[PDB]
Design a protein around this ligand. Sequence first.
Ligand SMILES: [Zn+2]
Ligand SMILES: [Zn+2]
Lengths: 113, 272, 119
Amino acid sequence: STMKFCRECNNILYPKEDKEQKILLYACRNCDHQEVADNSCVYRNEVHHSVSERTQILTDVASDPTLPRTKAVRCSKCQHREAVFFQATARGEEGMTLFFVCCNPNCGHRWRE
Amino acid sequence: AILGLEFPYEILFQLNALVHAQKISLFAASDMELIKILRGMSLETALVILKKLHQQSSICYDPVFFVKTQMASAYKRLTEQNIMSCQRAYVTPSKIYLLGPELETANYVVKNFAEHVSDFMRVTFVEEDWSKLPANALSVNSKEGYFVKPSRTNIYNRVLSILGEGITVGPKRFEFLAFSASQLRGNSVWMFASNEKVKAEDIREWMGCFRKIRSISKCAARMGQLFSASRQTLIVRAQDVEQIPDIEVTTDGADYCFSDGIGKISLAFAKQ
Amino acid sequence: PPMDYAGSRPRLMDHDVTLEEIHKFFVDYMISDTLGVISTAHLVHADRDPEKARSQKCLELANLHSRAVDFAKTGAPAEMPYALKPREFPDFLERFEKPTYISESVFGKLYRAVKSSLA
Ligand SMILES: [Zn+2]
Ligand SMILES: [Zn+2]
């Protein structure tokens, strides 16, 4: 996805590989000029999901899913059954441990499993 | 630095314990005459007069007049009834109280380290009334942001600093060794003064290798489990031990193990 | 049938102990140490509400007691709720400052018999 212009005629260069040279080379079809390549990079693209441009706002693509909610657990500070549960790692521990966040607007309490 | 001499450690510890008690103030025992008199004397008589002064019913104002008017076995005790003199300290948010060399039952760690009988000191963190620290005195809760987050108080940092830097009493510095299961429920911890012969790390690695345990609570429990009172018996090498397989049953999707800590013994072993 | 004996999931670290997190655990053991109040709350709730040890409150108290007695083994706080506090104590207790209520359970009868025998 890279491009450069040869200093001779200022035209685009296409990459090519030579078995005898065993090195990356760039030469344009306008003039018979061959220049050495730098960094041996012919393609470099950052992976992005911006394919459906100007369409993700109208149709809900659900890029960020919502956390599940449960009512079996019971909060400690308040007697509310609705809570949000999810899995995340600890500060230094290994693996996935279950967490809980109270759904009461006036409680704001979170506890582990 | 005020003394700057070869004053012994036991006498200095006894003097500090007496000063901590409501018997003699700080300046009344910091004069040159008292230490000059107490420097060169008989050790047993000095201990006797010090404990007699500590036994005074009221507050003593002039110690010099009182002291003017007044005038091996550890190993055997450990082998007979495990009798040792252990120092007990009480750390409060305001000050620290030293109880003194109180007699108590000896544990296993002092059996092979009986020469440093004075380096072991029990440290208990209590309140000013020598009671348990309330939950409001450590990590009081406060609502900051969307969720509540506890805020550590200055007592929390003080306890952390005391545990880290350690307690210095005279020409010694006590380091954290471990704490037993009973001491964890009583806010108590063992401290050992590092010496040129054996340090705290030496004892810690002599007890065992605890790097295999990756749990914070489990490692502490395994390090402190070997501090119960016990009676010494013969020594058995690691050549004659069995590896009997155990029995496990899994019903209703639940792991039920019959053999948790069961074992097998012979008759000759019981007789011995 | 007995209650389930399955404890909490163990917490394993990705590094060795540097003698600091053990101090953190030792200091934090004082905070949220509700081992001694769970039994008192369970006794008060059993003495107050009839058909004791049958309601879900007693089961919750027993589960919290098991989790608190598992604190010394695994780093799991008991998380004692505020609504389960008794706020009342029977006669056979040393909490003179706290309010005292006359209990009519078997323990109340035993304490009254002891009081009559001593007097
Ligand atoms: Zn060109
Ligand atoms: Zn809540």
